[PDB]
Amino acid sequence: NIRYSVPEETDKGSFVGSIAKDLGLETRELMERGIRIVSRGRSQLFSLNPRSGSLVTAGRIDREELCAQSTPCVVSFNILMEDEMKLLPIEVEIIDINDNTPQFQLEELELKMSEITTPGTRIPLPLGQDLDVGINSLQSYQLSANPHFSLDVQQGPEGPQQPEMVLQRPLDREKDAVHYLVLTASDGGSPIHSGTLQIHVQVVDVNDNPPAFTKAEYHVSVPENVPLGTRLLKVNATDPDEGANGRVTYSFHKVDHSVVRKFQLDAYTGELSNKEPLDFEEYKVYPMEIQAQDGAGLMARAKVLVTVLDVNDNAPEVGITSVTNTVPENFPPGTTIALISVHDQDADNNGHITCSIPGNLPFKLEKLVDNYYRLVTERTLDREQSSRHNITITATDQGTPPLSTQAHISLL
Amino acid sequence: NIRYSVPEETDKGSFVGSIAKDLGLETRELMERGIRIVSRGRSQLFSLNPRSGSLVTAGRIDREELCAQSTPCVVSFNILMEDEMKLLPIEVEIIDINDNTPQFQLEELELKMSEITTPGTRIPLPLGQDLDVGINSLQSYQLSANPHFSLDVQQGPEGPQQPEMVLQRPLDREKDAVHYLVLTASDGGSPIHSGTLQIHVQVVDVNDNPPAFTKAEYHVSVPENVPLGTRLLKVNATDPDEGANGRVTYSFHKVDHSVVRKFQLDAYTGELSNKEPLDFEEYKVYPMEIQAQDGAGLMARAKVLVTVLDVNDNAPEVGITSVTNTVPENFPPGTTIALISVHDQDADNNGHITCSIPGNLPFKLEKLVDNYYRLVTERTLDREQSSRHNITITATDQGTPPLSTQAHISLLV
């Protein structure tokens, strides 16, 4: 049993072993025995020269073609010596070399992972196969640098097995929606042959962000006589989510509908304008809470305060709250014939009321408490001179433009 | 200024105070004064009888109609004494009673809140309005018991303002999709009247649950001769989420496609069957990783092991690795004429190799190293008796049913 060692992929005619030296044969003795190689499929790679006694290579010795993945790879063929008709077992071990690159069964691996994927989730990676064996076979995986993922390689007896990609830092689609990684598989030769696997990690969206107003409280000041449908304000709300999770619509929070009903907020543009007249008397200010809803149950809040300014638009009102229609012929000076109830719905200088009566007639109005005015007479009237009187009392407020209300009293 | 006090909703003619008693005037003296009602806009609700000297009520005194929510509610009107022509204002305070229930401006407040809503979110609630005043006005809010929500009321000097509903424990649509609450507003009378506002909080779905397999590792044993397309297994994964987030689709994890390519997995029904033949050789077992995907990027993993049974289906193979065709006429007994290399691809009793040669001829086969067989000579054959030889060697394996391979070798003298 003769055993040699030759690397694989040798050049044609490369020396393997000299049979002459190990059998003790010269050139002549080899010629006399008539040594020649016994053929079978595999011995076609080996060539025996009967004069030099040197078994050399006859062709390409691709050990991956011969033994695939086994070790060691030894080719056994018989040498026929015609003299004694003697067979001689020659076994030649094929040492492995590195001439192949690890091949992934694809070029781009595309995966879908939600942004709420719990960190630590594992993804088995495609296996890369190095055609060589031994030290020139698959030796290591390397995941391209990225904060969100890490590489986990199980140490196996034959080599690295079952590569896995682990989620480290939690995903955020609003920051990075697509992560490109590169899984490089490398053997252990010199130089090292690396096969690359492109990884396309796509992040799926989840409604995790409610709208956000530009201001927490929206203030505005408006005249009371402001016409209907005047644009009071425009709010602004943003949503960073994708698609239906990021389309906002505004609406009124059901607070006090007696206040909300006096206003109008466009659901799409968010422009608040007035729908009903604005009266300073009932409401000086208008507090309202507004709401912005996206498409998936999230919402945001904001406050809107509509302060009403005052301008003279309400005239005082005079109520004929007292009338003594029958007034004596001999009444003394200082007797009240009528008491009136005066009231202006406005404030400041626009809300004070003065009383006016024609000054020729004897009776006059004096100052009394709380816009009440007492009509007391200052002289005597003749029974013959005046039988019937149709008097016109004038109540004017003092804020320009002044507003006035008249009351007419008939007396006898 | 004389001030009296009468409650609201009094019967007609009810006593307040005797004006004759307070003015120190008798029945006659006031009649001489000519005391009479000064008739203000709302003064007809007051009735003065000019004989008893007691200004009493004339009708229903509904102060909620009078002063609404103001305080205090005092009615001022003048008493005219015709004697000195002197006016005297009488003020009567209207004492409040409880005849109204707090009324909400709607019947059901319905809201949509995502299951991922950050706890602590506040929702201003619709105001309930009690027409009464004082202690008979709105006094308290009460939110019905619920683990996820609580009531927060801002108090005022007069009473409660801006009731707000706060989310405490985070919502789960997979557990509770609809929450019904009852907001009761109550005054402070005796008995207390409560108005109710039904609340309908709907929870919107969010992909917060990954698939879940029924088994972590799927083991199965199938004969090697199994035909193509035979149903091997069925996996099952459930998801409690709603809609597209809760129906699963199965697929192979991209690991080794040389193993996956030999199989077929329906993505929807999840029934695994074979697509290519299964040979016990090359692969004794078949390990595979499977993946369950919902509709929104979540996934689950499971293992499936398809173990191949072993069956005698590969016959041993005989290789004529050596043949010395030229053989002397006078060769002695014991000389090898041919060496054969036989090999069976199975194991155990199905993998042991036996050799058979014609027993009439002198040559016989003896076993040497491992699986090699040597054709040795035992006697002499005459060239005249036999010039050419067509040999039939049959190799049989030892596992039932036995498989045999025949080889024919031609030799001459």
Ligand SMILES: *[C@@H]1O[C@H](CO)[C@@H](O[C@@H]2O[C@H](CO)[C@@H](O[C@@H]3O[C@H](CO)[C@@H](O)[C@H](O)[C@@H]3O)[C@H](O)[C@H]2NC(C)=O)[C@H](O)[C@H]1NC(C)=O
């Ligand atoms: C030793 O002798 C045997 C016969 O005893 C030889 O085997 C024979 O080989 C021939 C092929 O040349 C077979 O012919 C076959 O005919 C059938 C008819 O249907 C068909 O299958 C094919 O057309 C085929 O040619 C013949 O059947 C076969 N003998 C037997 C019994 O099956 C053998 O070749 C001889 N070996 C040597 C080294 O001389």
Ligand SMILES: *[C@@H]1O[C@H](CO)[C@@H](O)[C@H](O)[C@H]1NC(C)=O
């Ligand atoms: C306000 O909203 C508009 C509408 O998209 C947007 O363009 C703008 O950026 C927002 N305001 C700010 C300060 O970004």
Ligand SMILES: *[C@@H]1O[C@H](CO)[C@@H](O)[C@H](O)[C@H]1NC(C)=O
């Ligand atoms: C004075 O007022 C009374 C009130 O009814 C009316 O009837 C009368 O016609 C008025 N005087 C004149 C001259 O019109």
Ligand SMILES: *[C@@H]1O[C@H](CO)[C@@H](O)[C@H](O)[C@H]1NC(C)=O
């Ligand atoms: C298996 O999946 C089906 C699919 O709807 C389901 O009906 C069944 O409940 C699942 N298995 C069990 C044990 O529930």
Ligand SMILES: *[C@H]1O[C@H](CO)[C@@H](O)[C@H](O)[C@@H]1O
């Ligand atoms: C592995 O390393 C080789 C060099 O040995 C590169 O060519 C390859 O791209 C990978 O980075």
Ligand SMILES: *[C@H]1O[C@H](CO)[C@@H](O)[C@H](O)[C@@H]1O
């Ligand atoms: C990995 O690297 C190879 C070259 O080694 C490229 O061809 C491939 O596209 C991937 O980037």
Ligand SMILES: *[C@H]1O[C@H](CO)[C@@H](O)[C@H](O)[C@@H]1O
């Ligand atoms: C408020 O309280 C009253 C009793 O005071 C109940 O009748 C009502 O249903 C609500 O609970």
Ligand SMILES: *[C@H]1O[C@H](CO)[C@@H](O)[C@H](O)[C@@H]1O
């Ligand atoms: C609360 O209770 C009132 C009765 O007080 C109902 O009318 C309402 O629908 C809610 O159930």
Ligand SMILES: [Ca+2]
């Ligand atoms: Ca090679």
Ligand SMILES: [Ca+2]
């Ligand atoms: Ca290599």
Ligand SMILES: [Ca+2]
């Ligand atoms: Ca190699």
Ligand SMILES: [Ca+2]
């Ligand atoms: Ca996010």
Ligand SMILES: [Ca+2]
């Ligand atoms: Ca998102």
Ligand SMILES: [Ca+2]
């Ligand atoms: Ca959103």
Ligand SMILES: [Ca+2]
């Ligand atoms: Ca006004």
Ligand SMILES: [Ca+2]
């Ligand atoms: Ca005014």
